[PDB]
Amino acid sequence: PNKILYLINPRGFCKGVSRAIETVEECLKLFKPPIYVKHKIVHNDIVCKKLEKEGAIFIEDLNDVPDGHILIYSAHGISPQIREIAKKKKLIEIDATCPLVNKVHVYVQMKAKENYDIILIGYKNHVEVIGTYNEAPHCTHIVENVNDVDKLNFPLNKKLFYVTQTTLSMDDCALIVQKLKNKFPHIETIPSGSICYATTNRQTALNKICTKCDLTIVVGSSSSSNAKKLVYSSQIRNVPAVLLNTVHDLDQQILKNVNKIALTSAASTPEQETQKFVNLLTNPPFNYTLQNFDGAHENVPKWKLPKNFLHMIKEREK
Ligand code: F3S
Ligand code: NA
Numbered sequence: 614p615n616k617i618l619y620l621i622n623p624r625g626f627c628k629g630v631s632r633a634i635e636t637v638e639e640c641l642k643l644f645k646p647p648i649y650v651k652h653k654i655v656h657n658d659i660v661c662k663k664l665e666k667e668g669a670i671f672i673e674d675l676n677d678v679p680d681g682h683i684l685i686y687s688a689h690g691i692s693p694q695i696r697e698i699a700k701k702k703k704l705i706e707i708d709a710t711c712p713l714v715n716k717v718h719v720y721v722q723m724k725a726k727e728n729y730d731i732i733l734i735g736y737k738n739h740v741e742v743i744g745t746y747n748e749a750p751h752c753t754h755i756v757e758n759v760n761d762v763d764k765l766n767f768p769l770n771k772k773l774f775y776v777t778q779t780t781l782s783m784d785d786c787a788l789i790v791q792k793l794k795n796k797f798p799h800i801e802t803i804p805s806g807s808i809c810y811a812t813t814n815r816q817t818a819l820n821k822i823c824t825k826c827d828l829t830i831v832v833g834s835s836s837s838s839n840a841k842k843l844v845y846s847s848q849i850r851n852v853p854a855v856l857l858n859t860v861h862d863l864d865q866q867i868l869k870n871v872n873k874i875a876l877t878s879a880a881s882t883p884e885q886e887t888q889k890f891v892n893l894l895t896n897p898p899f900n901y902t903l904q905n906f907d908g909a910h911e912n913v914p915k916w917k918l919p920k921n922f923l924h925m926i927k928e929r930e931k
């Protein structure tokens with residue numbers, strides 16, 4: 614019948630990711646490779662491999678970093694402890710933590726100083742969650758599921774504040790929050806919430822269109838949580854979905870009998886990888902008719918690069 618490819622917007626790079634990439638690229642222009650980055654700068658192998666070629670090196674052990682040298686913190690943020698270590702080595706700290714991850718770090722410190730205990734909804738082994746946790750480790754409690762909620766116990770007078778990983782499924786998050794609120798009715802949180810505009814926007818747009826479709830293709834890396842949550846958002850809405858890093862990974866057999874495809878991409882996914890899908894699917898032998906699907910207009914934040922890094926740039930151009 615009628616074959617259609619719904620190319621969805623918004624999709625692809627968020628501002629935290631573009632800022633983080635530009636931060637690394639701009640360091641490489643100024644200072645001589647190698648440029649050391651703590652953890653993968655964003656969770657996309659294609660982006661990271663390109664930077665490795667250009668002279669970046671992603672490390673987990675700060676001893677792999679020469680004293681006095683540049684170290685960049687990834688978009689996902691970092692534990693405070695890592696920082697004090699950096700200063701001991703007199704490193705040039707260049708912090709590309711996403712402002713909306715920093716937002717969570719900041720509320721956590723602020724509420725802990727007000728003697729709240731903090732509930733952190735997110736996945737225990739995600740670098741973002743670990744980094745946020747370590748801002749107030751002795752008064753924070755991570756929950757990744759509703760079992761963890763049942764286990765929480767606090768005196769009745771104890772003030773509680775919850776916060777979340779920025780890239781959760783809005784559906785799962787709401788589930789856990791609802792259970793949290795049942796148990797702790799007076800629990801407080803960030804008014805604007807912790808789940809970022811990019812996560813909300815990409816899931817919201819996909820959710821609106823996926824139910825007209827037979828298959829959802831999400832372009833992105835399996836190491837990316839928000840990519841995985843896009844796939845999940847489609848599945849719990851009963852439309853099969855797959856996460857693919859690149860067109861080469863597409864098993865073209867799964868397109869047999871699918872006439873309508875919802876196509877989107879994660880916040881860490883380069884637009885070129887998504888275009889290769891559009892090119893493959895809208896041309897022979899597949900001939901899906903291309904249509905755009907627009908969720909609400911996304912307002913792209915006007916974040917600048919890290920200020921100390923900008924100061925450097927200003928100098929050198931003298
Ligand atoms: S937290 Fe920041 S890095 Fe992107 S996915 Fe959200 S804007
Ligand atoms: Na603490």
Ligand code: NA
Binds near residue numbers: 803805
């Ligand atoms: Na705020």
